[PDB]
Amino acid sequence: QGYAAEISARRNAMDNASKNAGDMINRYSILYNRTRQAVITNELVDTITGASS
Amino acid sequence: TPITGKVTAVIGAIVDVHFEQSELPAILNALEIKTPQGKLVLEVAQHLGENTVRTIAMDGTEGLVRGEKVLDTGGPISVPVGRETLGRIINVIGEPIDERGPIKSKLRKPIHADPPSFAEQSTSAEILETGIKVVDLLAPYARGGKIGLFGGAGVGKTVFIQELINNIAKAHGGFSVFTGVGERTREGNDLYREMKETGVINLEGESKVALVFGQMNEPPGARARVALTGLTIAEYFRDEEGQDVLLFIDNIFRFTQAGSEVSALLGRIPSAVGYQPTLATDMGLLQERITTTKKGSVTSVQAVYVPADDLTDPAPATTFAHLDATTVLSRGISELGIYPAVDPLDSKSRLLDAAVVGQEHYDVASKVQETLQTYKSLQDIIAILGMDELSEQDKLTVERARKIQRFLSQPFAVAEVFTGIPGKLVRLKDTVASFKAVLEGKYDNIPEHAFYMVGGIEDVVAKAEKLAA
Amino acid sequence: ANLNETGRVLAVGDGIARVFGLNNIQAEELVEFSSGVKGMALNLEPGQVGIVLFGSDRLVKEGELVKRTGNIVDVPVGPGLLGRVVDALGNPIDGKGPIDAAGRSRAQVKAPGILPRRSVHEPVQTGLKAVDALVPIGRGQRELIIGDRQTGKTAVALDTILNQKRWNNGSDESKKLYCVYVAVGQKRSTVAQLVQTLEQHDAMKYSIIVAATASEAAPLQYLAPFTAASIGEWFRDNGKHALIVYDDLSKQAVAYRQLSLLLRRPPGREAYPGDVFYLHSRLLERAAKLSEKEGSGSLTALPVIETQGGDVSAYIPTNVISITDGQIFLEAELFYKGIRPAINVGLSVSRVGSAAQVKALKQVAGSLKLFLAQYREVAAFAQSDLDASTKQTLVRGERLTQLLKQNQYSPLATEEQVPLIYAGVNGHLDGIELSRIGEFESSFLSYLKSNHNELLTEIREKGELSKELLASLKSATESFVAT
Amino acid sequence: NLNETGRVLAVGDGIARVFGLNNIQAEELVEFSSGVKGMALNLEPGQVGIVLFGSDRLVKEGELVKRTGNIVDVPVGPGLLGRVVDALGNPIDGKGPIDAAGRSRAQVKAPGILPRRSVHEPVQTGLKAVDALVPIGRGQRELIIGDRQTGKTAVALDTILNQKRWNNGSDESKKLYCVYVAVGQKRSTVAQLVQTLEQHDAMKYSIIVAATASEAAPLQYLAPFTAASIGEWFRDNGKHALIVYDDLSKQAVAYRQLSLLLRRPPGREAYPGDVFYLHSRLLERAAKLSEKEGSGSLTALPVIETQGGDVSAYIPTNVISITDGQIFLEAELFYKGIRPAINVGLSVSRVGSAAQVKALKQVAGSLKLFLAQYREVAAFAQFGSDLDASTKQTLVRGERLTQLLKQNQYSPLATEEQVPLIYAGVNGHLDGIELSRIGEFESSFLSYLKSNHNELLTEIREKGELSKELLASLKSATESFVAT
Ligand SMILES: Nc1ncnc2c1ncn2[C@@H]1O[C@H](COP(=O)(O)OP(=O)(O)NP(=O)(O)O)[C@@H](O)[C@H]1O
Ligand SMILES: Nc1ncnc2c1ncn2[C@@H]1O[C@H](COP(=O)(O)OP(=O)(O)NP(=O)(O)O)[C@@H](O)[C@H]1O
Numbered sequence A: 001q002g003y004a005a006e007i008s009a010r011r012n013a014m015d016n017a018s019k020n021a022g023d024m025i026n027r028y029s030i031l032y033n034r035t036r037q038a039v040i041t042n043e044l045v046d047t048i049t050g051a052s053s
Numbered sequence B: 001t002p003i004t005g006k007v008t009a010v011i012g013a014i015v016d017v018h019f020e021q022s023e024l025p026a027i028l029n030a031l032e033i034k035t036p037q038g039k040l041v042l043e044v045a046q047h048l049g050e051n052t053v054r055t056i057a058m059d060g061t062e063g064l065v066r067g068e069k070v071l072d073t074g075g076p077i078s079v080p081v082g083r084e085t086l087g088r089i090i091n092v093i094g095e096p097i098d099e100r101g102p103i104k105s106k107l108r109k110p111i112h113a114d115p116p117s118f119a120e121q122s123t124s125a126e127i128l129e130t131g132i133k134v135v136d137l138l139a140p141y142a143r144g145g146k147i148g149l150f151g152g153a154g155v156g157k158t159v160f161i162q163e164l165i166n167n168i169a170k171a172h173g174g175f176s177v178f179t180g181v182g183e184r185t186r187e188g189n190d191l192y193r194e195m196k197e198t199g200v201i202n203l204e205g206e207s208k209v210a211l212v213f214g215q216m217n218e219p220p221g222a223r224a225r226v227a228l229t230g231l232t233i234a235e236y237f238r239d240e241e242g243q244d245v246l247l248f249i250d251n252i253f254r255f256t257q258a259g260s261e262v263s264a265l266l267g268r269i270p271s272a273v274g275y276q277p278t279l280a281t282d283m284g285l286l287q288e289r290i291t292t293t294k295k296g297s298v299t300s301v302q303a304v305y306v307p308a309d310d311l312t313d314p315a316p317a318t319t320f321a322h323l324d325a326t327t328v329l330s331r332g333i334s335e336l337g338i339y340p341a342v343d344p345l346d347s348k349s350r351l352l353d354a355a356v357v358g359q360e361h362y363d364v365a366s367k368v369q370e371t372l373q374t375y376k377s378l379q380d381i382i383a384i385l386g387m388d389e390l391s392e393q394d395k396l397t398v399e400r401a402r403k404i405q406r407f408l409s410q411p412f413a414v415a416e417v418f419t420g421i422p423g424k425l426v427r428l429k430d431t432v433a434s435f436k437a438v439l440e441g442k443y444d445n446i447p448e449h450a451f452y453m454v455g456g457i458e459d460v461v462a463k464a465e466k467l468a469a
Numbered sequence C: 001a002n003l004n005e006t007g008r009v010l011a012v013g014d015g016i017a018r019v020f021g022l023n024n025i026q027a028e029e030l031v032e033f034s035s036g037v038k039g040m041a042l043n044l045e046p047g048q049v050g051i052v053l054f055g056s057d058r059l060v061k062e063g064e065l066v067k068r069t070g071n072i073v074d075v076p077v078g079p080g081l082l083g084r085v086v087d088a089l090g091n092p093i094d095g096k097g098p099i100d101a102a103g104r105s106r107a108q109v110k111a112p113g114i115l116p117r118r119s120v121h122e123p124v125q126t127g128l129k130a131v132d133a134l135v136p137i138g139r140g141q142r143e144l145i146i147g148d149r150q151t152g153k154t155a156v157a158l159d160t161i162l163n164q165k166r167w168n169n170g171s172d173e174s175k176k177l178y179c180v181y182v183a184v185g186q187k188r189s190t191v192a193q194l195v196q197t198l199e200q201h202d203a204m205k206y207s208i209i210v211a212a213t214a215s216e217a218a219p220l221q222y223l224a225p226f227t228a229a230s231i232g233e234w235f236r237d238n239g240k241h242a243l244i245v246y247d248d249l250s251k252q253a254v255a256y257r258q259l260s261l262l263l264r265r266p267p268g269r270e271a272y273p274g275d276v277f278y279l280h281s282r283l284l285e286r287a288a289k290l291s292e293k294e295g296s297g298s299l300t301a302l303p304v305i306e307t308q309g310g311d312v313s314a315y316i317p318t319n320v321i322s323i324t325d326g327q328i329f330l331e332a333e334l335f336y337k338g339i340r341p342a343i344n345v346g347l348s349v350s351r352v353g354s355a356a357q358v359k360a361l362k363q364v365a366g367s368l369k370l371f372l373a374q375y376r377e378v379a380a381f382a383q384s385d386l387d388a389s390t391k392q393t394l395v396r397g398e399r400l401t402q403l404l405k406q407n408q409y410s411p412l413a414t415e416e417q418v419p420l421i422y423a424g425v426n427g428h429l430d431g432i433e434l435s436r437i438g439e440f441e442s443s444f445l446s447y448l449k450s451n452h453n454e455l456l457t458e459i460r461e462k463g464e465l466s467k468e469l470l471a472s473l474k475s476a477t478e479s480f481v482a483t
Numbered sequence D: 001n002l003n004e005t006g007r008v009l010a011v012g013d014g015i016a017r018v019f020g021l022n023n024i025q026a027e028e029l030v031e032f033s034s035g036v037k038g039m040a041l042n043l044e045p046g047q048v049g050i051v052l053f054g055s056d057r058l059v060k061e062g063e064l065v066k067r068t069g070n071i072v073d074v075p076v077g078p079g080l081l082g083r084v085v086d087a088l089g090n091p092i093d094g095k096g097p098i099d100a101a102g103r104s105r106a107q108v109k110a111p112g113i114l115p116r117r118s119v120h121e122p123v124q125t126g127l128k129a130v131d132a133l134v135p136i137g138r139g140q141r142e143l144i145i146g147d148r149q150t151g152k153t154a155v156a157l158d159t160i161l162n163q164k165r166w167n168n169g170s171d172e173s174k175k176l177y178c179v180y181v182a183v184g185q186k187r188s189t190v191a192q193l194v195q196t197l198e199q200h201d202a203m204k205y206s207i208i209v210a211a212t213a214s215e216a217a218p219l220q221y222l223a224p225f226t227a228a229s230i231g232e233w234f235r236d237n238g239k240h241a242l243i244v245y246d247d248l249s250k251q252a253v254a255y256r257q258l259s260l261l262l263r264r265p266p267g268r269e270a271y272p273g274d275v276f277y278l279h280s281r282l283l284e285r286a287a288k289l290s291e292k293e294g295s296g297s298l299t300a301l302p303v304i305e306t307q308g309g310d311v312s313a314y315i316p317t318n319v320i321s322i323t324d325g326q327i328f329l330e331a332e333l334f335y336k337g338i339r340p341a342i343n344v345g346l347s348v349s350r351v352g353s354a355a356q357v358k359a360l361k362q363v364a365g366s367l368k369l370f371l372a373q374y375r376e377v378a379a380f381a382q383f384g385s386d387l388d389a390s391t392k393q394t395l396v397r398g399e400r401l402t403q404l405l406k407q408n409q410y411s412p413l414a415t416e417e418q419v420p421l422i423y424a425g426v427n428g429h430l431d432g433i434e435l436s437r438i439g440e441f442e443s444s445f446l447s448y449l450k451s452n453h454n455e456l457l458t459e460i461r462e463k464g465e466l467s468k469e470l471l472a473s474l475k476s477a478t479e480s481f482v483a484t
């Protein structure tokens, strides 16, 4: 019975872990894309500043 | 019998002026132009050669024509100094904007002055009790020191600064100078009324505070200078009247931002992130003047806007070294309702030293930070896997950290309209003893919410017993 | 061949005409080109003037004549613009003929200083249950509407302009609130359809539309809000109250960066110029509540900002957040769920409104604000226990949630709002099914409209509740529930 | 005659474009008619780019500019000891003239491949963690790196303070003369530091060279190089000097300002293309000289600031590749109670155990690796795992060794004090003591050895090694104290 009780708890545990783990992934991907875009802009600025003279 | 020249170029805040013959006006000199409104004042920033100077204007340059007449004043922007400025509201160019007529001062000093030398420095370490828990416990402010309140947009800088004006300025005894830099004209107005309604300013008696404004409605020239105006007034009180000056500035970030709006137009190759190459030296020339010398002392509080919540942005980044205490307000914390939104781990003071605050205070502060740090080290494990995956050791340290965190919040008197609870001022010794006790595991059997938005330990028990029923 | 009132085009490209001469020109003076297109004298140098074009580059050629106006960029203002739709320069575009103007304000005008102002005390009643109870707007205030794309941002502005039908019909001048809607970068089709709605609800007669749509020369988009501000200001300056909606500032700032880049101004964060903050700050500073000595006129601004993927940390959003007196944040997560208005409670604040919100709402919404910012918190931690005490608060939370869903184009008077809030906060809804709360509303309204009309009359006229009147609604509600 | 003098064509932001000066050397000093000094960096055909060492409020178009005939130099010599001067070595403490034994230029070549000998002499910091795990040699260059407010200065400062133990003796070769360079710091902060140095009787062997936040960018740029030459006098004349560049992050920022305003087309993050060379030539000047050159040495501790722990940033990356090892400070460690907040995993001193006292080397057998094994072990603990005889035993000791390395500020220890504690830690003698009591174990075990076993310490402070006899004598002396 303890076994059965554990397996059904571990399931529900993993189920929320996956839910939170997956919800964090969304917020980090969003952060990634900002930081990706920012890296392109900033390299582009250096190159534009350099050519400006 | 003066020296005149003509306007040769206008680009936004930048006006190039040519002078007919042998004498060009010195860099930093104020020049003037007749308008059907009043005068437009220009400051000489550089010498272009071929008898032209480049100036930053101090107001909108709408309507200026090429070939218009410009008059050298033979000096920099001057401001009224001395007791005659208290209870008045002042321009960047030292004009009264309170419809109360002339500010008849005896002397009118220039706003550009060399910072106090190395031998003129006066180093000390007295604690300035603020009555605000987080600061008093973890990052205490220093008398005659510089203090920065770092923050993203709408996280609580100004309220913090108004609380300290309210907590400290009233019963200080020395004079104050408040400089509004690139902030809400509305907020200026709002404060003016407060000074009357608390009696720091009396329209018909004695006044404790001078007011200087250059809000976010003025041009960059005005915003780039207005801090020097407020500063010059404060320097008189410190140096000539030997006073212990309180100089509040909100918001100092805007002085740098303004500098960057003209930088390109002054023909400088931009530095990292679009900022003027002169970022740090411009900051030094202002910041190094806001200082305690041997003649008197200057305790200063300065708001620091953090653009795009990025603390690494050149502007705020550069400011850090200039401050004796930093209190960093964090959007993350503010969105948990923990006010004041102080980051108890990224705020810092010089005076958190076992010699200055005593061993006990230091020890409590350290153990509090340790506990807060453990929780932070676990945020991610707590976030994904939750509380049940932790060792019973950590489970306890977290549960306590969660209480301490709430206990670091405090109803501000000025924030009454948002808490609905009357403000609390808590005393340093009462703060120190309270947290010491929470560390000693004497309050663990008590609900978290009891620690939220109260004063010292006696209110926690109070809220706890009330929330039982 | 006058070279003082007149110039020859040297070169044209990237939205800039370079002109020789125009010796007597003023900075920011408007010009007129051979082809009829207009421009602004932006920078005056020895030997040439740089002019920003208010149309397509096509329309200007090297060699063409350029004429002075002796006018700093300005617009027709006054009460004759009510019911009209104009472009950034104030040109009539509704096809309704010459604009009846009382005068002409400059586009750039300085904001009132420290002294001519007074604290907000008068409400702008949006007619939106969520807004007016939680984030109330005062006349003279600047509140920001901000959220992801397709999140009902416009609908909050719109249902506000609609809601003024109640007062702008009466004689009472001080209570009249004229509206100014500023469409910047939007589709022409949208704006036309929107104007269609304003007429359909009669509201067009007291509102003025200024539009620089999506395909129009960037500098016309950069200019729109300012000239719209001038127009809004006439009412402030003369003793009446105007509401101004900037839909949206994001697109304006985009239009602005275009010019700056094409002008070769150093790009900074996200390639926006250093002065993009100043762009917005000088604008929203013109929204003010004036003192006794200046007629007591009020300009209220509702800027709209578009976030990307709900990130309120971006450069432009935080800039405008740092200029306004609060923001109503609309969460894309709630909007998709059905909860509309999709107000995020924790992330929304009015900074000055409370002291201007009608006292009647203030009492019945006792701590409503701080509560909904906490139900939302305990709700996420619910999905380890089927606990007893927090279980009832969750039902309260859900009933208050479902109570704050509101239809578009359905704004309610304060007297309709107060009882609805009374029935929730005081737990009269906790015995009702979740899927029936919407039906409860208009049936509970039906009941108050045809029986207890005497309480409803009282609330409108006072703006308060007496102890006597509080015990009156107490009885009225409880009777209805059991039937 | 525009050979020796020129005329200002244009002036702004501390830069002057000057006509004439047709004989001026590159990097030569100039006086302006108004008083302010400056440096000629751009010899272009038509004109000269000159960067000023003062305010430009007083330079005017047409103003005359005079040659000096001098490449920027500074006063040097023992006369500077106990004084505070500016970038050009003008005295700023208001104590009168500087007593100069001569003048070195600001920009000097490093000692080449020949005039050197391998580093072999300890710079004792008095910091249990540094001395044991990242020991530093005379002639070495160790980098102190971390975010703001992590204890970076505090690591250089304890070291400066700790040289008290030899600087009051008559022995010269044992002495270490201190030069601290404040670049971009505010004045009140430098004041507060010399106020400490005075209070610990430490100013008398220190020279402070400071160019602070308010000062013209070329002054901040130049300050480390001039401070170097000041240190080099000691190195060149058979003595030892330590130099602390606090901090080079700020120096590079200044150097960028110069360049941008001179209109030298920028490189990465707007810095000059040669911003690495700026530092690389500076830190190559710290060296241990050969015998034929009198065995003198200059030891550099440059400080670098990171943002948000980004060691991978541009200027951090440069300097890491210049120095001989790094001390890495972490805020996360600061707040776990670990102070100095040294990251052992990341910290190295490449000179290694060649510049560590043999006694300390002996007791710190595998200690650096041992702690790596500890943090590998404590990583598997998080898994909520119960351990065995091997994994609990090591987890326990490492946790105690960590605690042993915690150290108060301004309180440097002697090697004869350090050696015992480490011996007591690594050899098992602390493993069964409550962790909150490891601080009290320190000063109690020290007190105990000072009275009862004072022959043991004298043997270590003078023989610097551990004979089998001393090890047995220590083994017993510790076990004795364990039961009080
Ligand atoms: N002590 C406090 N307690 C509760 N709420 C607070 C507190 N301080 C600030 N707030 C909230 O934060 C809002 C704005 O705070 P404010 O002091 O204006 O921060 P700010 O950073 O100066 N604003 P900005 O200039 O836009 O960046 C207030 O309207 C409150 O809703
Ligand atoms: N309370 C409401 N209930 C149901 N639908 C609504 C509500 N408010 C608005 N909508 C609709 O939802 C859609 C998007 O809302 P809208 O008012 O256009 O927000 P927005 O943020 O301006 N979108 P956009 O301008 O395209 O970025 C429109 O079709 C609206 O008519």
Ligand SMILES: Nc1ncnc2c1ncn2[C@@H]1O[C@H](COP(=O)(O)OP(=O)(O)NP(=O)(O)O)[C@@H](O)[C@H]1O
Pocket: B321, B349, B350, B351, B352, B353, D147, D148, D149, D150, D151, D152, D153, D154, D155, D339, D340, D407, D408, D409
């Ligand atoms: N061993 C220590 N134990 C406790 N506190 C310390 C220790 N070392 C330094 N501190 C304190 O930590 C704080 C910062 O140390 P400090 O030496 O100023 O670092 P820093 O890198 O110079 N900071 P900054 O110069 O602002 O970038 C000061 O308050 C010190 O007193």
Ligand SMILES: [Mg+2]
Pocket: B157, B158, B183
């Ligand atoms: Mg503010």
Ligand SMILES: [Mg+2]
Pocket: C153, C154, C247
């Ligand atoms: Mg819309």
Ligand SMILES: [Mg+2]
Pocket: D152, D153, D246
């Ligand atoms: Mg430091």
